[PDB]
Amino acid sequence: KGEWGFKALKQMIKINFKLTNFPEMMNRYKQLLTYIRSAVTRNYSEKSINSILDYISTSKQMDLLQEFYETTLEALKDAKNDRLWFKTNTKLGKLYLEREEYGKLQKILRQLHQSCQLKKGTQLLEIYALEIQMYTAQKNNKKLKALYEQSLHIKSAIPHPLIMGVIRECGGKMHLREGEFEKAHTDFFEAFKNYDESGSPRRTTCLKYLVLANMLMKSGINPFDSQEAKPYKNDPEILAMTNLVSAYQNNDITEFEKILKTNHSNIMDDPFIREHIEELLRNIRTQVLIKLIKPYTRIHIPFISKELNIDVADVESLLVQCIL
């Protein structure tokens, strides 16, 4: 059985690799490439476990990894080497961002032209997510928007549930920036749902954006009622957020302002809520004003000023804007 044969061969390979001495190993692995491929279906298990044993030396041995991936690309052209190759793209690229590896990564252009002008939904989604991440790192909004509209066409794919949640988050941010909150809410809900099952750092970050989008939706239905978001209700990072949600609905002013003032170092830090806070503190005031002047026929402006905790001029401006 040749399977255990090359298993023992790669075993020594790594035994000698602990004693460095690289050129012998590489050349042996190169000459055993074709034999291992033809003899037994290699695909994922053994080569990926070798890469798992090898990434522990990501610092240094960079040339060794580079030549390994070069020979894997130009020798394993038969069969599909792409799926783990975008993993190499994420490893090497997006570590130094704008390095020319980003320009080089477009050698999948033949598959791009084969698909666009399908059935390769997974690879297209993965490359779109990678390009979205790169262009978000470089802060190119037009390119992100173009990528999202181009990705919206694919509806016959089965992706890993982190690739999908990145393009969904990008689309939600684009919708929030443009001004369409209706799609932003559902996009951020989808991004949070996909992040919950797989992921860790950007998990209690899409929930906050989802909350903000729901609060910019003229209220209605507490986001902390679905089974996906309830467990994170008492999280210390999101306690201010759920307090804000509870304050917005059941219209009141003092609690909202107190929450905004107290959590100055936990809410008014990111550039996404620090800018949209002006739309808030105005919708709640408008709702309170509408609810207050319902049973009156002749009301005093200073009374409204006292109720809304703002001066006379702002009350007059708000009334004029509402009437117009």
Partner 1 sequence: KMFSLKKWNAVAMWSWDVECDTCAICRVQVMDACLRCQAENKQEDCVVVWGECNHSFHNCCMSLWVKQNNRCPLCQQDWVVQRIGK
Partner 2 sequence: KCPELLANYCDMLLRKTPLSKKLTSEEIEAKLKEVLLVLKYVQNKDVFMRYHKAHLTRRLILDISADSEIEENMVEWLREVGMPADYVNKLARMFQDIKVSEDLNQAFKEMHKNNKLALPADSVNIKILNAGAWSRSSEKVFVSLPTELEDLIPEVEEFYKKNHSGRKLHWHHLMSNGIITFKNEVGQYDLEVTTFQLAVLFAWNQRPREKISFENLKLATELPDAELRRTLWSLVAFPKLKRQVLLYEPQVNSPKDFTEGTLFSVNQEFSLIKNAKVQKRGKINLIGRLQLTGIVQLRILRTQEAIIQIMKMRKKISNAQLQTELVEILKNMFLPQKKMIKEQIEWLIEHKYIRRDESDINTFIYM
Partner 3 sequence: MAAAVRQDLAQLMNSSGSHKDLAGKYRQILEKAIQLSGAEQLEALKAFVEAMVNENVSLVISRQLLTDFCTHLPNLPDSTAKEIYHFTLEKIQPRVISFEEQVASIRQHLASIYEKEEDWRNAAQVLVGIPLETGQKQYNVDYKLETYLKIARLYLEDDDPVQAEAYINRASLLQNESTNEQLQIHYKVCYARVLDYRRKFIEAAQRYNELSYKTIVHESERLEALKHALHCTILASAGQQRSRMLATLFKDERCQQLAAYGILEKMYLDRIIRGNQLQEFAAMLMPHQKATTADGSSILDRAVIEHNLLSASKLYNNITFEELGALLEIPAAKAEKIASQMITEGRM
Closest among 64, 66, 69 to 20, alpha carbons compared: 64
Nearer to partner 2 by Cβ, of 222 and 287: the residue is 222
Nearer to partner 2 by Cβ, of 113 and 119: the residue is 119
User: Would you count residue 226 as binding partner 1 (CB under 8 A)?
Assistant: yes
Query: According to CB under 8 A, which one of 99, 160, 261, 291 is a site residue for partner 2?
Result: 160
Give the per-residue contact string, 59-98, with partner 2 (x = CB under 8 A; - = no): ---------------------x------------------
User: Would you count residue 182 as binding partner 1 (CB under 8 A)?
Assistant: yes
User: CB of residue 297 vs partner 3: minimum separation in angstroms?
Assistant: 12
Q: Which does 198 bind (CB under 5 to 8 A by kind): partner 3, partner 1, partner 2, none?
A: partner 2
The stretch among 24-32, 108-116, 154-162, 300-308 that binds partner 2 (CB under 8 A) is 154-162
Secondary structure in 3-state letters for the chain:
CHHHHHHHHHHHHHHHHCCCCHHHHHHHHHHHHHHHHHHCCCCCHHHHHHHHHHHHHCCCCHHHHHHHHHHHHHHCCCCCCHHHHHHHHHHHCCCCCCCCHHHHHHHHHHHHHHHHCCCCHHHHHHHHHHHHHHHHHCCCHHHHHHHHHHHCCCCCCCCCCCHHHHHHHHHHHHHHHHCCHHHHHHHHHHHHHHHHHCCCCCCCCHHHHHHHHHHCCCCCCCCCCCCCCHHHHHCCCCHHHHHHHHHHCCCCCHHHHHHHHHCCCCCCCCCCHHHHCCCCCCHHHHHHHHHHCCCCCCCCHHHHHHHHCCCHHHHHHHHHHHHC
User: Would you count residue 197 as binding partner 2 (CB under 8 A)?
Assistant: yes
Query: According to CB under 8 A, which one of 91, 94, 161, 239 is a site residue for partner 2?
Result: 161
Q: Which does 306 bind (CB under 5 to 8 A by kind): partner 2, partner 1, partner 3, none?
A: none
User: CB of residue 224 vs partner 2: minimum separation in angstroms?
Assistant: 12
Residues of this chain that bind partner 3 (CB under 8 A): 291-292, 294-296
Q: Which does 201 bind (CB under 5 to 8 A by kind): partner 1, partner 3, partner 2, none?
A: none
User: CB of residue 288 vs partner 2: minimum separation in angstroms?
Assistant: 33
Give the burial class of 59: count Cβ atoms within 10 A of its Cβ; 0-12 exposed, 13-18 middle, 19 or more buried: exposed
The stretch among 69-77, 93-101, 139-147, 178-186 that binds partner 1 (CB under 8 A) is 178-186
Report the interface residues with partner 1, using CB under 8 A: 182, 185-186, 189-190, 193, 221-223, 225-227, 230-231
Report the interface residues with partner 2, using CB under 8 A: 41, 43-44, 80, 119, 122, 156, 158, 160-161, 196-198, 200, 230-232
